[PDB]
Amino acid sequence: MEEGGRDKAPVQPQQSPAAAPGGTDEKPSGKERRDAGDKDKEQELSEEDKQLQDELEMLVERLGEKDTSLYRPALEELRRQIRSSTTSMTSVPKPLKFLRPHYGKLKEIYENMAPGENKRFAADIISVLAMTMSGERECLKYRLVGSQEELASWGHEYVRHLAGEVAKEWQELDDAEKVQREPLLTLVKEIVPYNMAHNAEHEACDLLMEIEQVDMLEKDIDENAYAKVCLYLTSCVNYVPEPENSALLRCALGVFRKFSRFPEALRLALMLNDMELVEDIFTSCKDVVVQKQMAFMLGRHGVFLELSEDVEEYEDLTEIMSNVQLNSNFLALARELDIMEPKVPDDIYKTHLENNRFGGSGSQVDSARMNLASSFVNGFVNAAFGQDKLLTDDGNKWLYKNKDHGMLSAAASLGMILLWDVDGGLTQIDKYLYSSEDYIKSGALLACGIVNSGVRNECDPALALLSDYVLHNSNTMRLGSIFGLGLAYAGSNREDVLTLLLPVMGDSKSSMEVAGVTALACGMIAVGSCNGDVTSTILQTIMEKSETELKDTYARWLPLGLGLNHLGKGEAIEAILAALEVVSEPFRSFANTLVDVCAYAGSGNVLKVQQLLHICSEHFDSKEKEEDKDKKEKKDKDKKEAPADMGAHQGVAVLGIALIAMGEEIGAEMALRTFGHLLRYGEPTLRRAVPLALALISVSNPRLNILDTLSKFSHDADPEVSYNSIFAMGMVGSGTNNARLAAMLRQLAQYHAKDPNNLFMVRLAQGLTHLGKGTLTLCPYHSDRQLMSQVAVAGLLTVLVSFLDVRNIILGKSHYVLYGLVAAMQPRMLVTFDEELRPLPVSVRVGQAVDVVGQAGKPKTITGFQTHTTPVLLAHGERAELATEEFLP
Amino acid sequence: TPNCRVALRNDSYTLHKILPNKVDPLVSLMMVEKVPDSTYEMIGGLDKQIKEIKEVIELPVKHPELFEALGIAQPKGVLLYGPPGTGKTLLARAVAHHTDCTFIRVSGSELVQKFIGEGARMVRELFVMAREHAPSIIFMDESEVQRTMLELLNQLDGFEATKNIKVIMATNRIDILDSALLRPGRIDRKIEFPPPNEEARLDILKIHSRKMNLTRGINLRKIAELMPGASGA
Amino acid sequence: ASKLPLVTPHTQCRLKLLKLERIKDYLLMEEEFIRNQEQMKPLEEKQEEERSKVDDLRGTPMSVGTLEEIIDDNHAIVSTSVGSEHYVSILSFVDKDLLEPGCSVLLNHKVHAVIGVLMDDTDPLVTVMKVEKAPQETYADIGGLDNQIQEIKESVELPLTHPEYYEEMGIKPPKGVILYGPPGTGKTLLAKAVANQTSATFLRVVGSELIQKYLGDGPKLVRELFRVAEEHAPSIVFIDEIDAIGTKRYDSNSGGEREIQRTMLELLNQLDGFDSRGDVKVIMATNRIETLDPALIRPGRIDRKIEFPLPDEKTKKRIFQIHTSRMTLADDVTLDDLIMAKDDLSGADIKAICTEAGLMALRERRMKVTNEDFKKSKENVLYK
Amino acid sequence: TYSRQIKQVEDDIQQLLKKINELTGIKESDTGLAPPALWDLAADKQTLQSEQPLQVARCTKIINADSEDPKYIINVKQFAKFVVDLSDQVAPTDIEEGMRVGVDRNKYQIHIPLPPKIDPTVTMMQVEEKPDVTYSDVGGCKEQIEKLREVVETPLLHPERFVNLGIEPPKGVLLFGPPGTGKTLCARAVANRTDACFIRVIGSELVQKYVGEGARMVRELFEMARTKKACLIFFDEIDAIGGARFDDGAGGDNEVQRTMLELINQLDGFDPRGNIKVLMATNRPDTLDPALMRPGRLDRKIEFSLPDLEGRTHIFKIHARSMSVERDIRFELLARLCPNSTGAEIRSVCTEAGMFAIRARRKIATEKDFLEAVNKVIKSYAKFSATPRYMTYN
Ligand SMILES: Nc1ncnc2c1ncn2[C@@H]1O[C@H](COP(=O)(O)OP(=O)(O)OP(=O)(O)O)[C@@H](O)[C@H]1O
Ligand SMILES: Nc1ncnc2c1ncn2[C@@H]1O[C@H](COP(=O)(O)OP(=O)(O)OP(=O)(O)O)[C@@H](O)[C@H]1O
Ligand SMILES: Nc1ncnc2c1ncn2[C@@H]1O[C@H](COP(=O)(O)OP(=O)(O)O)[C@@H](O)[C@H]1O
Ligand SMILES: [Mg+2]
Ligand SMILES: [Mg+2]
């Protein structure tokens, strides 16, 4: 205990502020010169942030605090200089002079006067000066003023400029990682009216720095994955002018403003398509930006590049339409025939090998429904140019035998054999088309709508499937002729053939298996306008669904195309437009949760989820709304898939936990779909947890729920070592898990993962987390499998060719004009950099390096070397132009 | 407690009661070996050697701080040497008896083996019982003993933190053992045991002649002169 | 509870806000998700009801059996403690994962069906060979060497503490390290300093106790040794005095030198198996570097070869300064006379003279150590 | 600004994870059970169904049958032997003699045949798993690689070019040279490329305590080798498993020689292993017995010598490709400076020469850093060097 001796600061600041009321009146010099000695000594003796134990800041206020409360308020003649010596001294220790109810009284020292040019004694010091005090301003004071008092007095007007010079003081001192504290000022300042602060720091951000555009830019997309509705509304439209006004990176526009497309304004992304068509540099980045506009996240664009300078760059649109689609063909035409892929791989049916010798004899399984899965010996392995010449005999001799939806299946397999094609796919159909069969012709002409997927050239505007449609008085001469057109033109926004498919809905024909997928065709086309589609659905919904109390043919099919007609926005107007549209009995109010949550594909608005789980949780439900709670559970499967990874382990720690183990019907019957709607990513935390409840069968329930989750469990792509878990399940599936209803299903499960080798990136998360429509084509099957009666007759229209938005696999691509460079790549784990010291260490998987078109995988981020610099777009996007530059000797 | 017998019912194997306390594997061991327990009162004329062995064994238990007063490490190894029949075993037994330490000699026998382990592939498995009776002293007779002592000292050169564990080797003819054992930092003190003189033969006649039914007037001095110093045996 | 490994944002940025608030969203959803179970599930309790149901499946006489094979369809051949073995089935609360051949299980008393598995109380030999705590003081206790200290930190410590240099270099650390020189020069002492320093699991075995009395028990001991060293983590295996396997012959060895040879063959494998070795470091020491097989000494099995010289006098005086630090040294003595008393004294010799001189002080109950203590002390230590 | 506000709201939800994960039931950390949410389907059915109808079915061993009648003779572990019967659920075909069968405890009759005993210490040396060494990494000995590889895999990958020519390919091969030459490393490439059962054997593992105990391990090894379709058996350091028979006076080293003779009889004499290929590897081949050196067992005798110049330069290109270096160095000077050296020594020069760059502060090593490696590894460590008395293999 070494006290005394050097105690000058607990003595003369103990005496002269005590004699300051005795030296204010009748002593004109000791009031102000001892205040000057109280200002430069408290100033200079507290500028250093190494001695935070100042000798007055925790010492003078034992008497100087009551001296302050009897000094500034109790004086009443505060003039022009003694405020600049008084309120510059009394304002520095006041967040620590007071205790935690300072927050309502930061103004009883400061609002008397803000003294002059406050940063003059806040230049060197980082945050112990007042930056903490200004955080105390914007936390509580600007919240209480700017709750309903935004346009206001001194508590807003000067506070803009105080919150401007402190915000530039963060980017003034060091260019440290205290720079990123400025969005914590700009957000917490005026949370809902974010525009007025982003105007105050967007042009200051223009004059800020160009090296400080990359981490500020990913700082703003680092909120702008998802937010609250108005914060996502304002911060994403404030996100856009940072690579245009200040920065000139200018090439990550469309894939990162697909975020800013739907909920903000549908014309905003059109104005940013104009901003694409202004920056007309030359050909590399101009090429690469409009590459993604066809088959990477959206379509509906191929009528916007017909300007008056059609030579090559405005003639790019046909190359976008079909030539780089022919590069996606050229993937399997040139760069997959060389590595492994033969004409007929065929060896997975060969991998079903030793059940003749696994404990006994064999040649017992002779079920006719096994050939429904032996059709996918032809169907699943022949993707990516696995075309066959007289190797389709397993569908040819099954095509003329029985199983009319199997005559739909083998002829429908030719579209899965010839994918992304325009060249000969219409000719490969006609060699098996002519059979005078309403099944063979509608499966094969249904595959005509599968071959041209992503082409949208002259294949069938009214050509082939109109001729397939006009025959109708009967079965598939009515059904399969609209699904290939909604599938093929699902990426298009053409209104004319949508009105050709409008009397298919407005027919009021008794073909309900056709009118149900009519909404599943027209809903796949448009997601925006044409309320006449929703009118044509709801009028048949009232004319047919009201005067009945029957099965889920109405429920699984008719409002689902309305969810696909109103997918992807957080505005909560469409829930009023559709929830007050079918105000009705609750079986017609099945569609209460359809359009309400189908608009909420990726965000966070968990106040939706409490009204997604507190209205109808279980309630013991004596056979009343188990299907409505299975749809209420079905709408838990969005909100999760692309909101930037972080959610999978707690999704499985929800639905692997308390419905599937401690539920009644929603868990045991249905709740496994989330693991085939969220994912196909692949991790052992649920891949080694679903066969824990799936390897046991539990035949008490309607056992095709657990067997419905068998093949669905095997829904996961990116093929792995799961042949143990699925091959043991089909080996016990030989004796048990009887082959009279699932002989299609077990080898559907075995063939689903690795039908081929490649082509699995279908999981709706492009670049980092962009959409790219993995919902309008993937949705009606997971909606379609709720009850039953569709594993044999009706749902065979869906179980083959439901999801067909397979936007390939790989990103190792050169796309130079000559096509002569290979790559300079280095694939790794997902990124580790937000900030570290200097050169931000990107990730940690340095041990691998490739140069060729090889496999992708999900959690991969790919960089390089050789001083190539990747100067095109740099983030992601899988078609970098890959030019080089050599200012590096 | 672990390693305790119980009573046990047979129909459901419900735990019934808690019988005695069995027996410590070391008490069985020393019961097998049966060292001839000794004391200071049966020492014949070895008093300077007693003063030597007190300094190495007696002091660093009663006063471990006393070496920290001098900043020096405590000794750990004792070598005794001399002809057989000269009180080595009773001395090393007696010092442990008076300082109250668990006198544990090792012989490398295999009747001992079942109380050490099932195979006990090292010698080091003894140390569980050693630090379980932690104030203890390890004793050895007269090449396998010599490698055994090296395997002990290589442990308590600093790799074992439990103190109050010391080793004693006794043999004759100090030149024929290992030079690596004769490394000067290894052994802490070596003590010679001489054959008894005419003085030191007399008091062993005195002590050992106690329990006989004598006759008055014996003149044991003449008899100790008649024996020209064979040994104490 | 091992919820998520992505912890990298590190700062007040917003990947943390969205991501930590994202698992926070799914824990509000998880809490109100499970809240409906305790709200509206009065059928069973399931926290102990089905637990007591399992405990009513399994009987109270839980017998302990042994695995020897596995057939996947929840039945296998297990061995009883008698020796007679069965073909019982396996329950579904037995989470078939900790089932290896030779594992201890729990069987029924009646039908002997596989109830549960048993955690092993481990072999005592692991606790025998595992060094528990730090032995002594740090590298500052050593003094004088200063070059091979950089060598040992170079090969062992710096690979552990800085795994960045070898990756920006594109290189692996050097594998094998051997120590040799005259006796008593600090070979074991430096290993004590490493055992102070590291965070890896540290193993020490004398080279003398490698040899056995039964046939093949040596190489079996080697195989289970490197089993133990591998099955932990980034460890350090120390071997002292490995010449003693070749110098002395003992009569307990039922085999001749053509069993010692085979032991050296199995060890010669276990330094350089074709199998993936892993994160095991090997430190070896002897004083007869010329005796043993150089096939064990080749680079690939031992990379760095480090000689320890005799101390020069400048270093000797430093060692006197170390071992006379905390003792009450009387001013009578002159250490420079004590340096050149023996021309080739070891570092152990100095400590022997100091400790024995302190014993000469405690013979006379004093507190300081005088000159004649050293004068007769060098006669006691050196000359006999 | 919200420093505590993200702290306590982070912390009560990180705790509130556990505060309802106790309400899940993951707790009561076991002594060998399982989690509560798993087996919940063997809860009322298989608890009374895999237990109450299901027996114990103690497993036994057949001695023999007899004619005209089933009337089998059983044998068990310790107890007596019986006259037993089939079940109705089994055919009398696969109840062949010397077989383990599952047998009820009351009538004592046969339910199912069993696989034979394997002695799973033999199962431990099945490799189950492959290393990563590529034939790219075994540069310098290309013709040794080819002459080995045509014996190892070409009949296995193509059993038609030998049949249509009409030859039986050779079945045995040993590999030998100085130590560190790339023998074991060369075997790792074979275990990389192949597909059949790769059953490794290290010769010192067969030294047992009992008499003839190792020979039964040989027998079981060749039995489970005969169970497979094609199999690869690897041998390493077979000097320990046998040099030669030399015995005189007090019979020494006999137990090794009986095991070596059993290995001879399992290789040749009375019905060949058939589709079983072996592969040996030693340091010194001089000590080995000539009956083991007979072809039909050891047909190929691949030499591994030191690389001439170009194999060495190729090895510098292998071990030096993946490190930050000065660009304009040459390796040919270094291969001039290493006349007699192994790929292990070349690798140690590379991995040391990087450490010379790590000495002061650089990022890329230099030619003089290589020169600091050469005199140290070659000429400073030249006292031991391990090679010359192994050149004569003594
Ligand atoms: N350079 C030194 N500085 C200080 N003390 C030393 C030095 N060298 C040896 N010693 C002392 O010598 C004693 C013996 O050391 P150590 O056993 O490590 O030598 P060694 O060469 O390993 O002996 P051995 O050859 O018997 O194994 C140590 O306790 C240490 O205090
Ligand atoms: N041709 C080569 N190319 C690359 N590396 C080689 C070559 N030859 C040897 N090496 C290196 O030498 C080391 C030793 O290899 P290997 O274990 O096969 O030696 P060996 O010839 O079997 O001798 P030993 O039986 O002593 O191990 C390997 O780690 C390898 O890196
Ligand atoms: N000084 C002595 N006083 C009494 N008895 C002694 C003395 N010296 C030796 N003996 C006798 O010698 C025997 C012990 O011999 P000892 O030296 O302890 O072991 P060893 O002879 O094996 O080294 C005892 O029977 C003891 O009675
Ligand atoms: Mg030593
Ligand atoms: Mg080798």
Short mmCIF file of all heavy atoms in Angstrom, two decimals, chain B residues 154 157 180 183 186, chain C residues 141-145 182-190 192 240 286-287 308 311 319 322-323 346-349 351, ligand 1:
data_model
loop_
_atom_site.label_atom_id
_atom_site.label_comp_id
_atom_site.label_asym_id
_atom_site.label_seq_id
_atom_site.Cartn_x
_atom_site.Cartn_y
_atom_site.Cartn_z
N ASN B 154 16.54 -44.11 -13.18
CA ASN B 154 16.10 -43.38 -14.36
C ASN B 154 14.66 -42.91 -14.23
O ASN B 154 14.25 -41.99 -14.94
CB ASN B 154 16.26 -44.25 -15.60
CG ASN B 154 17.71 -44.41 -15.99
OD1 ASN B 154 18.48 -43.45 -15.98
ND2 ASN B 154 18.10 -45.64 -16.32
N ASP B 157 14.99 -39.91 -11.25
CA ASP B 157 15.95 -38.87 -11.54
C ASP B 157 15.24 -37.53 -11.68
O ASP B 157 15.91 -36.49 -11.79
CB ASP B 157 16.73 -39.22 -12.82
CG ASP B 157 17.97 -38.37 -13.00
OD1 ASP B 157 18.96 -38.59 -12.27
OD2 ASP B 157 17.95 -37.47 -13.87
N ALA B 180 28.54 -47.13 -15.63
CA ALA B 180 27.41 -46.23 -15.75
C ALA B 180 26.70 -46.06 -14.43
O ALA B 180 26.14 -44.99 -14.15
CB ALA B 180 26.44 -46.73 -16.82
N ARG B 183 28.86 -43.61 -12.53
CA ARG B 183 28.84 -42.22 -12.93
C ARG B 183 28.62 -41.37 -11.69
O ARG B 183 27.71 -41.67 -10.91
CB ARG B 183 27.74 -41.97 -13.96
CG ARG B 183 27.72 -40.58 -14.54
CD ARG B 183 26.60 -40.45 -15.55
NE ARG B 183 25.30 -40.64 -14.91
CZ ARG B 183 24.63 -39.67 -14.31
NH1 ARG B 183 25.12 -38.44 -14.28
NH2 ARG B 183 23.46 -39.92 -13.75
N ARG B 186 25.30 -40.20 -10.11
CA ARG B 186 24.24 -41.18 -9.92
C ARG B 186 24.06 -41.53 -8.45
O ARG B 186 23.00 -41.30 -7.86
CB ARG B 186 24.54 -42.43 -10.74
CG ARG B 186 23.50 -43.50 -10.63
CD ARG B 186 22.21 -43.04 -11.27
NE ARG B 186 22.36 -42.89 -12.72
CZ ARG B 186 21.45 -42.33 -13.50
NH1 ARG B 186 20.33 -41.85 -12.98
NH2 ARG B 186 21.66 -42.23 -14.80
N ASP C 141 17.69 -23.58 -17.04
CA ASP C 141 18.48 -24.40 -16.12
C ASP C 141 19.67 -25.05 -16.82
O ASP C 141 20.63 -25.44 -16.15
CB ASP C 141 17.58 -25.47 -15.50
CG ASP C 141 18.13 -26.04 -14.22
OD1 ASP C 141 19.16 -25.53 -13.73
OD2 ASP C 141 17.54 -27.01 -13.70
N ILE C 142 19.65 -25.14 -18.15
CA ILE C 142 20.66 -25.94 -18.84
C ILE C 142 21.97 -25.18 -18.94
O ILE C 142 22.96 -25.55 -18.30
CB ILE C 142 20.17 -26.32 -20.25
CG1 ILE C 142 18.85 -27.08 -20.17
CG2 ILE C 142 21.22 -27.15 -20.95
CD1 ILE C 142 18.23 -27.30 -21.52
N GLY C 143 21.99 -24.10 -19.71
CA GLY C 143 23.20 -23.32 -19.86
C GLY C 143 24.27 -23.95 -20.73
O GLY C 143 24.47 -25.17 -20.74
N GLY C 144 24.98 -23.10 -21.47
CA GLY C 144 26.20 -23.49 -22.13
C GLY C 144 26.03 -24.13 -23.49
O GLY C 144 26.94 -24.01 -24.32
N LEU C 145 24.92 -24.81 -23.75
CA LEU C 145 24.82 -25.57 -24.99
C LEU C 145 24.42 -24.67 -26.15
O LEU C 145 25.18 -24.50 -27.11
CB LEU C 145 23.83 -26.73 -24.81
CG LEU C 145 24.28 -27.68 -23.71
CD1 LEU C 145 23.32 -28.85 -23.57
CD2 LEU C 145 25.71 -28.17 -23.88
N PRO C 182 29.70 -38.26 -24.58
CA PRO C 182 30.20 -38.85 -23.34
C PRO C 182 29.10 -38.92 -22.30
O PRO C 182 28.09 -38.21 -22.41
CB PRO C 182 31.31 -37.87 -22.92
CG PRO C 182 31.73 -37.24 -24.18
CD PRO C 182 30.49 -37.10 -24.99
N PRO C 183 29.23 -39.77 -21.28
CA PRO C 183 28.16 -39.89 -20.29
C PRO C 183 28.10 -38.70 -19.35
O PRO C 183 29.10 -38.03 -19.08
CB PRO C 183 28.53 -41.16 -19.52
CG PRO C 183 30.00 -41.27 -19.67
CD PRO C 183 30.30 -40.76 -21.05
N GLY C 184 26.89 -38.44 -18.86
CA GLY C 184 26.68 -37.40 -17.87
C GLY C 184 26.85 -35.99 -18.39
O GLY C 184 27.27 -35.11 -17.63
N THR C 185 26.53 -35.74 -19.65
CA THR C 185 26.72 -34.43 -20.24
C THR C 185 25.42 -33.68 -20.47
O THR C 185 25.45 -32.58 -21.03
CB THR C 185 27.48 -34.55 -21.56
OG1 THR C 185 26.73 -35.37 -22.46
CG2 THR C 185 28.83 -35.18 -21.32
N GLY C 186 24.29 -34.23 -20.06
CA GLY C 186 23.03 -33.54 -20.17
C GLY C 186 22.04 -34.12 -21.17
O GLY C 186 21.08 -33.42 -21.51
N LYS C 187 22.25 -35.36 -21.62
CA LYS C 187 21.36 -35.96 -22.62
C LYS C 187 19.97 -36.16 -22.05
O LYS C 187 18.97 -35.78 -22.67
CB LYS C 187 21.94 -37.29 -23.10
CG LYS C 187 23.34 -37.18 -23.69
CD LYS C 187 23.85 -38.49 -24.24
CE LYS C 187 24.18 -39.47 -23.13
NZ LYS C 187 25.31 -39.02 -22.27
N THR C 188 19.88 -36.73 -20.85
CA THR C 188 18.59 -36.88 -20.19
C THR C 188 18.06 -35.53 -19.73
O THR C 188 16.84 -35.30 -19.73
CB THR C 188 18.74 -37.84 -19.01
OG1 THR C 188 19.45 -39.01 -19.44
CG2 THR C 188 17.39 -38.27 -18.49
N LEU C 189 18.96 -34.61 -19.39
CA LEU C 189 18.60 -33.30 -18.85
C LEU C 189 17.85 -32.46 -19.89
O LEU C 189 16.84 -31.82 -19.56
CB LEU C 189 19.87 -32.60 -18.39
CG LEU C 189 19.93 -31.36 -17.49
CD1 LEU C 189 19.72 -30.06 -18.24
CD2 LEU C 189 18.92 -31.49 -16.37
N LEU C 190 18.33 -32.47 -21.13
CA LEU C 190 17.65 -31.75 -22.19
C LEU C 190 16.27 -32.34 -22.45
O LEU C 190 15.32 -31.61 -22.74
CB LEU C 190 18.51 -31.76 -23.45
CG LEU C 190 18.14 -30.85 -24.62
CD1 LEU C 190 19.42 -30.39 -25.28
CD2 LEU C 190 17.28 -31.56 -25.65
N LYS C 192 14.45 -33.67 -20.15
CA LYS C 192 13.63 -33.11 -19.08
C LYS C 192 13.15 -31.71 -19.44
O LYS C 192 12.01 -31.34 -19.13
CB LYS C 192 14.40 -33.06 -17.76
CG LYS C 192 14.69 -34.40 -17.13
CD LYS C 192 15.33 -34.17 -15.78
CE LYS C 192 15.58 -35.48 -15.06
NZ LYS C 192 16.64 -36.27 -15.74
N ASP C 240 15.85 -43.81 -23.84
CA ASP C 240 17.19 -43.59 -23.33
C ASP C 240 17.95 -44.90 -23.33
O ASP C 240 17.37 -45.96 -23.06
CB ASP C 240 17.15 -43.03 -21.91
CG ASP C 240 18.49 -42.46 -21.46
OD1 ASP C 240 19.45 -42.46 -22.26
OD2 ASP C 240 18.59 -42.00 -20.30
N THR C 286 21.98 -42.14 -26.38
CA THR C 286 22.94 -43.16 -25.99
C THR C 286 24.27 -42.48 -25.72
O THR C 286 24.42 -41.27 -25.90
CB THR C 286 23.11 -44.23 -27.06
OG1 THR C 286 23.99 -45.25 -26.59
CG2 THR C 286 23.70 -43.61 -28.31
N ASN C 287 25.25 -43.27 -25.32
CA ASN C 287 26.63 -42.83 -25.29
C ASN C 287 27.55 -43.68 -26.15
O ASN C 287 28.72 -43.31 -26.32
CB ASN C 287 27.16 -42.78 -23.85
CG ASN C 287 26.98 -44.08 -23.12
OD1 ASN C 287 26.48 -45.06 -23.67
ND2 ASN C 287 27.40 -44.10 -21.87
N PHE C 308 27.00 -34.28 -28.27
CA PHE C 308 27.18 -33.41 -27.12
C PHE C 308 28.64 -33.41 -26.72
O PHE C 308 29.15 -34.44 -26.27
CB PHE C 308 26.33 -33.85 -25.93
CG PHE C 308 24.87 -33.56 -26.08
CD1 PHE C 308 23.99 -34.02 -25.13
CD2 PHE C 308 24.39 -32.79 -27.12
CE1 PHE C 308 22.65 -33.76 -25.23
CE2 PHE C 308 23.05 -32.54 -27.23
CZ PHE C 308 22.18 -33.02 -26.28
N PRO C 311 32.26 -30.04 -21.73
CA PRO C 311 32.13 -28.59 -21.50
C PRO C 311 33.49 -27.90 -21.55
O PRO C 311 34.46 -28.36 -20.96
CB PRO C 311 31.52 -28.51 -20.10
CG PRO C 311 30.90 -29.84 -19.88
CD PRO C 311 31.79 -30.81 -20.57
N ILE C 319 28.04 -23.37 -15.34
CA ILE C 319 27.37 -24.48 -14.67
C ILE C 319 27.60 -24.42 -13.16
O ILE C 319 26.70 -24.74 -12.37
CB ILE C 319 27.85 -25.81 -15.28
CG1 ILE C 319 27.42 -25.89 -16.74
CG2 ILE C 319 27.26 -27.01 -14.57
CD1 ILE C 319 28.06 -27.01 -17.50
N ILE C 322 25.15 -22.00 -11.99
CA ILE C 322 23.81 -22.56 -11.89
C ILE C 322 23.67 -23.39 -10.63
O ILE C 322 22.77 -23.17 -9.81
CB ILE C 322 23.48 -23.39 -13.15
CG1 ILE C 322 23.38 -22.48 -14.37
CG2 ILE C 322 22.19 -24.16 -12.95
CD1 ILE C 322 23.30 -23.22 -15.68
N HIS C 323 24.56 -24.35 -10.43
CA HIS C 323 24.41 -25.26 -9.30
C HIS C 323 24.88 -24.68 -7.98
O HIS C 323 24.77 -25.36 -6.96
CB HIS C 323 25.13 -26.57 -9.59
CG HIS C 323 24.52 -27.35 -10.71
ND1 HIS C 323 23.34 -28.04 -10.58
CD2 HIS C 323 24.93 -27.55 -11.98
CE1 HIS C 323 23.04 -28.63 -11.72
NE2 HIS C 323 24.00 -28.35 -12.59
N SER C 346 32.44 -33.71 -16.03
CA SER C 346 31.13 -33.61 -16.65
C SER C 346 30.26 -32.60 -15.91
O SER C 346 30.62 -32.10 -14.84
CB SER C 346 30.43 -34.96 -16.67
OG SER C 346 29.99 -35.31 -15.37
N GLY C 347 29.10 -32.32 -16.49
CA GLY C 347 28.12 -31.49 -15.81
C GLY C 347 27.53 -32.15 -14.58
O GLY C 347 27.06 -31.45 -13.68
N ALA C 348 27.56 -33.48 -14.51
CA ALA C 348 27.13 -34.16 -13.31
C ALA C 348 28.16 -34.06 -12.20
O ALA C 348 27.81 -34.12 -11.02
CB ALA C 348 26.83 -35.62 -13.61
N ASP C 349 29.43 -33.91 -12.57
CA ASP C 349 30.50 -33.89 -11.58
C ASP C 349 30.42 -32.64 -10.72
O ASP C 349 30.65 -32.69 -9.51
CB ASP C 349 31.85 -33.97 -12.28
CG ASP C 349 32.02 -35.25 -13.04
OD1 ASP C 349 31.43 -36.27 -12.62
OD2 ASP C 349 32.72 -35.25 -14.08
N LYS C 351 27.66 -30.84 -10.03
CA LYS C 351 26.52 -30.99 -9.13
C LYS C 351 26.81 -32.00 -8.03
O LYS C 351 26.35 -31.82 -6.89
CB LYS C 351 25.29 -31.40 -9.94
CG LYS C 351 24.01 -31.53 -9.15
CD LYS C 351 22.85 -31.77 -10.09
CE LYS C 351 22.93 -33.15 -10.72
NZ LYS C 351 22.68 -34.24 -9.73
N1 LIG E 1 25.48 -28.41 -19.31
C1 LIG E 1 24.98 -28.71 -18.09
N2 LIG E 1 24.54 -27.75 -17.26
C2 LIG E 1 24.05 -28.03 -16.05
N3 LIG E 1 23.96 -29.27 -15.55
C3 LIG E 1 24.38 -30.33 -16.28
C4 LIG E 1 24.92 -30.11 -17.61
N4 LIG E 1 25.25 -31.31 -18.10
C5 LIG E 1 24.94 -32.23 -17.15
N5 LIG E 1 24.42 -31.64 -16.07
C6 LIG E 1 23.96 -32.32 -14.85
O1 LIG E 1 24.31 -33.69 -14.93
C7 LIG E 1 23.24 -34.51 -14.48
C8 LIG E 1 23.15 -35.73 -15.36
O2 LIG E 1 22.57 -35.28 -16.57
P1 LIG E 1 22.11 -36.32 -17.69
O3 LIG E 1 21.72 -37.61 -17.03
O4 LIG E 1 21.11 -35.61 -18.56
O5 LIG E 1 23.45 -36.55 -18.52
P2 LIG E 1 23.43 -37.79 -19.52
O6 LIG E 1 24.53 -37.56 -20.52
O7 LIG E 1 22.00 -37.98 -19.94
O8 LIG E 1 23.88 -38.97 -18.53
P3 LIG E 1 23.86 -40.50 -19.01
O9 LIG E 1 24.93 -40.51 -20.07
O10 LIG E 1 24.20 -41.26 -17.76
O11 LIG E 1 22.48 -40.76 -19.56
C9 LIG E 1 21.98 -33.68 -14.61
O12 LIG E 1 21.19 -33.79 -13.43
C10 LIG E 1 22.45 -32.26 -14.81
O13 LIG E 1 22.04 -31.45 -13.70
#
